């Protein structure tokens, strides 16, 4: 029952087509609670969860300022990178930054992280100790030395150890209405005959939280080692998630096949067959 708080930042330069766009999204586990977008009508930080809109006006003001200040830093960060890599001023470019903290099942701090990327490629990451950096290339090493002189590692370490964790417990408690209870998946098995000899069995898992789930097919109660036809887990669009696994079986002997579902909301793994 580990919990996390995460912030995803995206800065995209668009030469000729105006100022660089800035997006920031806030996550507690798999729930998005806060949003910033430079192209948005309201240039401020916006609530996305029921338990976040509880917060006062100053909260929204400081968090707007925070993202707005980050917007400036990444604006020049894009300008610096063009020079580092001798890139043309004409092309679009991307910087990404994901930071955050995790708490343990007891409540105590488990992990902190701060990773960055230029044009999809790794650039600089704070080490697991929260004291050292790892640069990906020679340009990122110049960035590294500058950040070590500026004590950025020490300044983020204080935030994760102090503020980040403290706010996470707060959101969890205020959000235990939705956050601290896992939604158990609705599982069904459907039958689709392709021909008179064979038939597709589909294992549906719908309306679950969190996103993590394992669907495993079994014949005669024996596991299927090799890849099965399945889809990458997708959002239902209401906070819950969806996934299905499909196998081709001979018609008539559908009883010999069972779907084995592993999910956090389930105390014991759930077994499903064609009803």
């Amino acid at each position: 029952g580990s919990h996390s708080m995460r912030y995803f930042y995206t800065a995209v330069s668009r030469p000729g087509r105006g100022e660089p766009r800035f997006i920031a999204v806030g996550y507690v586990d798999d729930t998005q609670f806060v949003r910033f977008d430079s192209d948005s009508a309201s240039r401020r930080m916006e609530p996305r969860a029921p338990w976040i809109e509880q917060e006062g006006p100053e909260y929204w003001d400081r968090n707007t300022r925070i993202a707005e200040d980050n917007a400036q830093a990444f604006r020049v960060d894009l300008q610096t990178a063009l020079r580092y890599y001798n890139q043309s001023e004409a092309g679009s470019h991307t910087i990404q930054w994901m930071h955050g903290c995790d708490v343990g099942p007891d409540g105590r701090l488990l992990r902190g992280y701060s990773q960055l990327a230029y044009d999809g490629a790794d650039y600089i990451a704070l080490n697991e100790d929260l004291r050292s950096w790892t640069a990906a290339d020679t340009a990122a090493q110049i960035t590294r030395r500058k950040w070590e002189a500026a004590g950025e590692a020490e300044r983020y370490r204080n935030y994760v150890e102090g503020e980040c964790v403290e706010w996470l417990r707060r959101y969890l408690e205020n959000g235990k209405e939705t956050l601290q209870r896992a939604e158990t998946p609705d599982t069904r098995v459907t039958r689709h005959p392709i021909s008179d000899q064979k038939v597709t069995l589909r294992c549906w898992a719908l309306g679950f939280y969190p996103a993590e789930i394992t669907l495993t097919w079994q014949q005669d109660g024996e596991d299927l080692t090799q890849d099965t036809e399945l889809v990458e887990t997708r959002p239902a669009g209401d906070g819950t998630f969806q996934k299905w696994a499909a196998v081709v079986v001979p018609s008539g002997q559908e009883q010999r096949y069972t779907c084995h579902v592993q999910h956090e909301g389930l105390p014991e793994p759930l077994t499903r067959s064609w009803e």
Binding site: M45, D69, D77, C164
Partner: peptide
Amino acid sequence: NGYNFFSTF
């Protein structure tokens, strides 16, 4: 809440 990032590239 969010984290201010002062240093740049």
